[model samples]
Target: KPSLTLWLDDKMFTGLINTGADVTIIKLEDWPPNWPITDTLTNLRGIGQSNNPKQSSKYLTWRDKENNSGLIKPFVIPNLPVNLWGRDLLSQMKI
Candidate 1:
C-alpha cells in the first residue's frame, strides 16, 4: 500500500493513499485537540457499513516531508480506521 507522512503545525500523521475514497478523512483520535472543527452537512457511507457516519470539516495546512504544503480540508470522523488521502487531497497534489 502507498503511504505518506503529513505535518500540520507541530503534529504529524502517517496516512494511506486511498483512491477508493471520495474525500480525504482523518480519524477523530488523530485530530489536534486545539484545532477548530466545523460541522459538515454531508454524511459518509462505506462498503459493508449500513449506517452513514457523521463528519466535521476543517481546513488545515498540511506539509509533506519535502515541505510542500497546501491548505486542504479534511473530514474528521469518529472511529475511522485510518487516515486516508482521498481524491480531494490527491487531486490537489496532482497525483
Candidate 2:
C-alpha cells in the first residue's frame, strides 16, 4: 500500500500506485473543470461499492507540462477517498 503524490499537468493528486488495477481512478471534485474529458474510454468494474462500472469513466488527457510535455491519459472515477494510479497510465509514462 505505497502512496505517492502525482501531478497531472499541474494538479497535485495523492495516489496509490496500484499496478494490479485495470485503470487509473481519481476523484473528479478536486480536478479543475477546464481539463479535458473523454467518454470514449472504459471503466473497470468491481472497483468500489455500488460501482456500476460504465464506459463513461472520465479521463484527463493532457501534456505532462513538466515531463517534456508528453501526452497522457489518466482514467478517472467520479468520487473516492483517495486516488488510484493504474498501470495503464503509468505504462504510458513508463514509470
Candidate 3:
C-alpha cells in the first residue's frame, strides 16, 4: 500500500494513494473547522460500496514531503475508513 504525507492548513495527515479512485476523499471528522462547504454533491460507487459525499469547491492548499504542493478540493464523507489520495490529487502531483 502506497502512502503519502500531506499537509493541510499546516496540519499533517496520512493519505493512502489509491490509483483506482476517481476523486479525492476525506472523512467529515478530518475536515477543518472553519472551511466552507459548497452546495455540490457527488455519488461515489466502488466495490459493493456507495456514498453521497458533500462537495466543496474551496481550493485547499496541500503539500507533500517532496515539496510538491497544490490546491485541491476533496469530497467529505462521514465515517470514511481512510483518506484517499485519489486521481484528482495524484494527477496534480504527477505520481
Candidate 4:
C-alpha cells in the first residue's frame, strides 16, 4: 500500500517544528500501538475510529514526550495488519 499516515502532511509537521527537517512530533489518527507487542515492535502506530472495524480497547502503558493519543478507530478486526492502513507509515512520521 501507499505510505501516508498524517492527515496534516509533512509540510504541516515541518511547520509545527518550525520547518526543521530534524525536528518533529507525529500524531496518528487512532491506531496507537500497545501491549507486550512493543517487545517485538518498537514503533508506535494508530488508526482513526472512522477507518477501522471494532474492538473494546484503550489504555496507555508507556510514556513519551508528547501526550497526544491521536484518532482511535476502535473496531479493527484482529486479522487486519497494522502495516497496511496506517501502522508503519505513522511510525515513520516520528514516534
The numbered model that scores best in TM-score is: 3
Clashes of each: 0, 0, 0, 13
For model 1, residues 1-95, the per-residue Cα lDDT tens digits are 48977786668988899878778788888987677776565655462223233344456777877787787777777777889888777776745
Superior candidate under TM-score, 2 versus 3: 3
Per-residue CA lDDT of model 3 for 13-90, tens digit only, reads 787888788888887788776777664434575522244467655877888878789988887777788888888888
- Candidate 2 residues lying further than 4 Å off, grouped into runs, are 40-43, 47-71, 92-95
Candidate 1 positional error at 3, Å: 1.5
What's the TM for model 2?
0.61
Candidate 2 residues 20-71, lDDT tens each? 8756766766556766655533435565434533222244443333553344
Ranking 1 against 2 by TM-score, winner? 1
Ranked by TM-score, the better of candidates 1 and 3 is 3
lDDT of each: 0.72, 0.58, 0.74, 0.29
TM-score, structure 3 vs. true: 0.79
Candidate ranking (TM-score, best to worst): 3, 1, 2, 4
> Model 3: runs farther than 4 Å from truth?
47-52
Give the Cα error of residue 52 in candidate 3, in Å: 4.9
Best by lDDT: 3
